[PDB]
Amino acid sequence: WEXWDXAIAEYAXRIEXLIXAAQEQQEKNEAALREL
Amino acid sequence: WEXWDXAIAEYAXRIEXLIXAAQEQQEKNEAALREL
Amino acid sequence: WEXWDXAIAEYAXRIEXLIXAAQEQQEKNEAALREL
Amino acid sequence: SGIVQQQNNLLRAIEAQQHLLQLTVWGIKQLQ
Amino acid sequence: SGIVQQQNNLLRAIEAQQHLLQLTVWGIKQLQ
Amino acid sequence: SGIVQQQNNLLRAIEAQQHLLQLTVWGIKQLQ
């Protein structure tokens, strides 16, 4: 119960980590592309 | 109730706007890449 | 019932097909970019 | 041509997930 | 500049879908 | 090398969202 609901909400932690990464890469990429 | 269910269905409006944008950019990008 | 629940789980088949494609393109693209 | 063919691949998955979400919100409202 | 503006477009949809999922998991836990 | 590393980043989020959806469809069918 409020163990599984733990596991699922804190996978949904991991995905909001993945969507971190992607925001950071989006910023690096913009800057880096402006410089080329 | 059928206020929240308003807010959520018409965010899900906004996302189907975002997925608009992305379809339009996908088309512009194809054409533009064929020309390079 | 266990017809609709068929249709939906086996669309969710199709999406896990789309996410196939994308994994395969990600691999081709890495390799191909390393070679340029 | 591959990076853009995969923008499309991702766009297609996102769009399917959206429809699948809508069927899920439908089930929830169908149980209220 | 278009391929990267669409990485953002996709990132924005994914991020909205995440929030929409969270409201959906909320409905389910709200019916238990 | 960054645009393609972010195709992967997006692919990874989409794939996690898919699994998370499946657990959500599971909750709904578990309440029927």
Q: Tell me the chain B residues in contact with residue E17 when contact means C-beta distances shorter than 8 Å.
A: 15
Q: Tell me the chain E residues in contact with residue F3 when contact means C-beta distances shorter than 8 Å.
A: 3-4, 7
Q: Which domain holds residue E25?
A: 1-32
Q: Tell me the chain E residues in contact with residue B23 when contact means C-beta distances shorter than 8 Å.
A: none
Decide if C9 and F1 are in contact by the 8 Å CB cutoff: no
- Number of domains, chain E: 1
How far apart are the C-alpha atoms of F6 and A23, rounded to whole Å?
A: 9
The domain limits of chain C are 1-36
User: Which residue stretches of B1-36 are H helix?
Assistant: 4-35
Experimental method: X-ray
If DSSP codes are grouped into helix, strand and coil, which group holds residue E1?
Answer: coil
| Those residues with Cβ within 8 angstroms of residue D8's Cβ, 6 or more apart along the chain or in another chain | B26
User: Are C and D touching by the rule of 3+ CB pairs within 8 Å?
Assistant: yes
| Those residues with Cβ within 8 angstroms of residue F30's Cβ, 6 or more apart along the chain or in another chain | none
How far apart are the C-alpha atoms of A23 and D2, rounded to whole Å?
A: 22
Asked whether E16 and D20 are in contact (CB, 8 A), the reply is: no
How far apart are the C-alpha atoms of E15 and A12, rounded to whole Å?
A: 11
Tokens of D4: 């853009």
D14 alpha carbon, distance to own chain's centre: 4
Asked whether E20 and D17 are in contact (CB, 8 A), the reply is: no
Asked whether C15 and D23 are in contact (CB, 8 A), the reply is: no
Task: Tell me the DSSP string of D1-32.
Answer: -HHHHHHHHHHHHHHHHHHHHHHHHHHHHHT-
Resolution in A: 2.6
Burial C21-36 (b: 16+ CB within 10 A, else e): bbeebbeebbeeeeee
**Most F CBs within 10 Å: which of E9, E17, E19, E20, as the mutation test of the F interface?**
E17
